[PDB]
Amino acid sequence: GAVTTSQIPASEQETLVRPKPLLLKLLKSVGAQKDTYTMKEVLFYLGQYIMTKRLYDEKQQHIVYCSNDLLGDLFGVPSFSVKEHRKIYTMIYRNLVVV
Ligand SMILES: CC(C)(C)S(=O)(=O)C[C@H](C1CC1)N1C(=O)[C@](C)(Cc2ccc(C(=O)O)cn2)O[C@H](c2cccc(Cl)c2)[C@H]1c1ccc(Cl)cc1
């Protein structure tokens, strides 16, 4: 129910957040059953989502294409690198309240 990364301080990935309605629906579409999460939890579910709807079928280039997927609207970008973790958190932050 969680994924952490070496690029973000360990404590930041425990930050408690309430996803805004769109982020929440994405989380809930892949099993999430609550409204309040830690950032590492959100990242886990977003990761699941990204892979259920095949937004990242090509693993060897580390790009998630999402221009015409909900994730694209959530992030407001057509695509992004899965290696650029700070940016991902940045984009996620916009779509939630920090408890
Ligand atoms: C199945 C896995 C391997 C458990 S996963 O982590 O859920 C897979 C997804 C994949 C859809 C893009 N994903 C990743 O593959 C990679 C890049 C795999 C990875 C994890 C850790 C480290 C490290 O600590 O150095 C390096 N690489 O991680 C993406 C990730 C994970 C946690 C936070 C962020 Cl911001 C990104 C992470 C990811 C990227 C984007 C989002 Cl929105 C969510 C998760």
Token duo for residue 65: 């294409």
Q: Tell me the residue type at 1.
A: G
Q: Domains of the chain (ranges plus CATH)?
A: 7-98 (1.10.245.10)
3-state helix, strand, coil in the chain (%, to 5): 45, 15, 40
Which amino acid does the sequence have at 89?
Answer: Y
CA atoms within 13 A on the CB side of 90: 10
PDB experimental method: X-ray
Q: How far is the CA of 21 from the centre of ligand 1 (A)?
A: 23
- Tell me the residue type at 53: K
8 A C-beta contact, residue 45 and residue 59: no
CB 69 within 8 A of CB 85: no
Please identify, by atom number, the ligand 1 atom nearest to the C-alpha of residue 86: 35
Output the CA torsion 82→97→14→74 (10° steps).
-10
Task: Specify the amino acid at residue 58.
Answer: E
Helices within 1-99 (DSSP H only): 21-29, 39-52, 70-75, 85-94
Specify the 3-state DSSP secondary structure of 95.
coil
Resolution (angstroms) equals 2.2
